[PDB]
Write a protein that binds this ligand. Structure first.
Ligand SMILES: [Ca+2]
Ligand SMILES: [Ca+2]
Ligand SMILES: [Zn+2]
Ligand SMILES: [Zn+2]
Ligand SMILES: [Zn+2]
Ligand SMILES: [Zn+2]
Ligand SMILES: [Zn+2]
Lengths: 131, 512
RNA sequence: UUCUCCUAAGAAGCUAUUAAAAUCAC
RNA sequence: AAGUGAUUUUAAUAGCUUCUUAGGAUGA
């Protein structure tokens, strides 16, 4: 009884960021030890012709991004632990995220290490042209 | 099967979730999934109020990372940390209303005999963050676990029973070892129930100290050893062994009672934790003294062993030089180490089994009373640290009294206890029926060393020509007091000397 | 008549999926 | 109304091998 929501490939990296004091730094280091990054993420069938921003309520990406399901990428909403930012709310859960396809094999590692630029509205560094 | 029962949504809501606010792909309902990739439809919006209990059952700690020390250890490094075994059994309830298909821990019990009774809580999934709140439970249907029915009403919130644990481990394991090795049987629902009080991470060090860090604290993000862990929530990096993967078939109560018969309310949450390590202790230590595995020094290890060797070198020489025994038997010494080399008796080594040497012609023999009641009739048999059920009528026994509890004497199987002092001796239960043929030993000191030339001591227990006279010499007063210190320290350590019926302390006097 | 290949049929097996039946641990 | 798994048996289905049968065509 109960709908299942996890595949056995992640069963050994979610059960290791679950028990961890800081599961951000404890997942950066999991990849370095030859492990494989988190899969089974949500991938949206957008049109690849949209204003590519980090977080938006509707799938909007360029020809080189790929809009994912926001929650799917927040590692914390993916191993069901507490979010570290004040008040404990996820800035992703509920809003589509668009990852550069250069790294779209493991978005869950992208959002953990990159950062959204405030006024440029895009992924700081991967399009943040703040010259 | 392509799935797992881990984080399996346990709600009773029919439909799935929106593309966003969906953890994985298998969780987006069939209204959105089209051609292996989800699509957004503005016809239906995302949710704003909902809660979906999450089943944290089926954790797999088979990871490995370059710094992170692993939990599950294998016997040979579980047998080296035997001072830090804590049985662990958690008995749990179910989920009933608007949530079905999951267990969640209710009563926890460790081998310290400590039932803690948490409240049924579980990680629900608000549309913003994975919460941690009460969920309505239902005691397990049946009768063998009937005691769980009136217990679902008298619990504690977790953050008040996460600190009862660390204030309980850090009382037992405070002065035995520097880690915790949960000796758990199922391995199943005992990792669903460690998500709530265990963190892990790279091996860090006690703040304010230098021992290994084995506690955490979400208030002041800082670690501690067992000593400086006052008011600390989580255990740090606990190791844990799984006992039924050592190859046991059948439930616990019928896999334990094959050996021990004094562990008994076998379905509560803490007598199923004492059976969980009384069965790990037994079939890991019961039948050998590995010798090869040294142990760290907790305290008094040198002095207790030195006092034991002194008193053993003492009493056997006294008995031999008193009763003029022609031959002396020996049982249970691994090598051939003659305790009194300056003797006339023939040291026939009736060892239990040959141990790594044949240089001294040690014999192989096992001792039982009904078998060897009339085999040894000549001389005296030295049963130093022997484990026989009953001792013969001519012997010098030193048996460890297993009813004394200390940081050395860990609890063991079948009433017997594990005395881990530089080695692991599994002495069986200390019963009075074993000493029906013997008596206790009086305190005394006898030496043939000539007297040489401060508080005057007058005690008839000391046997020296100087104290026989009016004035006691300073070449025997300090010897008497040091021997008294050794004797009392050993007796407090827990050994118990026994001697044959005809032992007369006066027979030593006429030797002078 | 022989060889190869193709189409179909029948057989047995392998692995994959679905359903129920039983057992064990929890 | 529906506790968690693990391995078992059969049935239903798909994929593939071999064997047999029939058909077609090539070549001697
Ligand atoms: Ca269990
Ligand atoms: Ca139990
Ligand atoms: Zn999140
Ligand atoms: Zn910018
Ligand atoms: Zn410390
Ligand atoms: Zn027992
Ligand atoms: Zn003297």
């Amino acid at each position: 009884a109960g709908n299942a929501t996890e595949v056995p490939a992640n069963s050994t990296v979610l059960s290791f960021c679950a028990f961890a004091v800081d599961a951000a730094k404890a997942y950066k280091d999991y990849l370095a030890s030859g492990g494989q990054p988190i899969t089974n993420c949500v991938k949206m069938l957008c049109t690849h012709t949209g204003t590519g921003q980090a977080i938006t309520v509707t799938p909007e990406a360029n020809m080189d991004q790929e809009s994912f399901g926001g929650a799917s990428c927040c590692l914390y909403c993916r191993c069901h632990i507490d979010h570290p930012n004040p008040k404990g709310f996820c800035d992703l859960k509920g809003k589509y995220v668009q990852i550069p396809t250069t790294c779209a094999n493991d978005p869950v590692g992208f959002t953990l290490k990159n950062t959204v630029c405030t006024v440029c509205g895009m992924w700081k560094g991967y399009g943040c042209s703040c010259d | 099967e392509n799935v797992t029962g881990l984080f399996k949504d346990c709600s009773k809501v029919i439909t799935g979730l929106h593309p966003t606010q969906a953890p994985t792909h298998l969780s987006v309902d069939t209204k959105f999934k089209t051609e292996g990739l989800c699509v957004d439809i503005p016809g239906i919006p995302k949710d704003m109020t909902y809660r979906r209990l999450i089943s944290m059952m089926g954790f797999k700690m088979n990871y490995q990372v370059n710094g992170y020390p692993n939990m599950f250890i294998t016997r040979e490094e579980a047998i080296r940390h035997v001072r830090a075994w804590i049985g662990f059994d958690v008995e749990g309830c179910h989920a009933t209303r608007e949530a079905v298909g999951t267990n969640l821990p209710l009563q926890l019990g460790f081998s310290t005999g400590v039932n803690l009774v948490a409240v049924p809580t579980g990680y629900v999934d608000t549309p913003n963050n994975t919460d941690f709140s009460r969920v309505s439970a239902k005691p397990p249907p049946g009768d063998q676990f009937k005691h769980l029915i009136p217990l679902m009403y008298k619990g504690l919130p977790w953050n008040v029973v996460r600190i009862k644990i660390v204030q309980m481990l850090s009382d037992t394991l405070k002065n035995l070892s520097d880690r915790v090795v949960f000796v758990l049987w199922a391995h199943g629902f005992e990792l669903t129930s460690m998500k709530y009080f265990v963190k892990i991470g790279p091996e860090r060090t006690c703040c304010l100290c230098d021992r290994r860090a084995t506690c955490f604290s979400t208030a002041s993000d800082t670690y501690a050893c067992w000593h400086h862990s006052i008011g600390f929530d989580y255990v740090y990096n606990p190791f844990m062994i799984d006992v039924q993967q050592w190859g046991f078939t059948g439930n616990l109560q019928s896999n334990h009672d094959l050996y021990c018969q004094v562990h008994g309310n076998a379905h509560v949450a803490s007598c199923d934790a004492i059976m969980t390590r009384c069965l790990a202790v037994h079939e890991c230590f019961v039948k050998r003294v590995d010798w090869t595995i040294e142990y760290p020094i907790i305290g008094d290890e040198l002095k207790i062993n030195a006092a034991c060797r002194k008193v053993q070198h003492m009493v056997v020489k006294a008995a031999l030089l008193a009763d003029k025994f022609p031959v002396l038997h020996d049982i249970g010494n691994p090598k051939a180490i003659k305790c009194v080399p300056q003797a006339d008796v023939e040291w026939k080594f009736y060892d239990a089994q040959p141990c790594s040497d044949k240089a001294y012609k040690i014999e192989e023999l096992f001792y039982s009373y009904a078998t060897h009641s009339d085999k040894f009739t000549d001389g005296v048999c030295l049963f130093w640290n022997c484990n026989v059920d009953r001792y013969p009528a001519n012997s010098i026994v030193c048996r460890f009294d297993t009813r004394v509890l200390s940081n050395l004497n860990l609890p063991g199987c079948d009433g017997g206890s594990l005395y881990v002092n530089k080695h692991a001796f599994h002495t069986p239960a200390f019963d009075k029926s074993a000493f029906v043929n013997l008596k206790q030993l009086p305190f005394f000191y006898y030496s043939d060393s000539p007297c040489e030339s401060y508080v005057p001591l007058k005690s008839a227990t000391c046997i020296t020509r100087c104290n026989l006279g009016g004035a006691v010499c300073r070449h025997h007063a300090n010897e008497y007091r040091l021997y008294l210190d050794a004797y009392n320290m050993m007796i407090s350590a827990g050994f118990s000397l026994w001697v044959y019926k005809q032992f007369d302390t006066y027979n030593l006097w006429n030797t002078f």
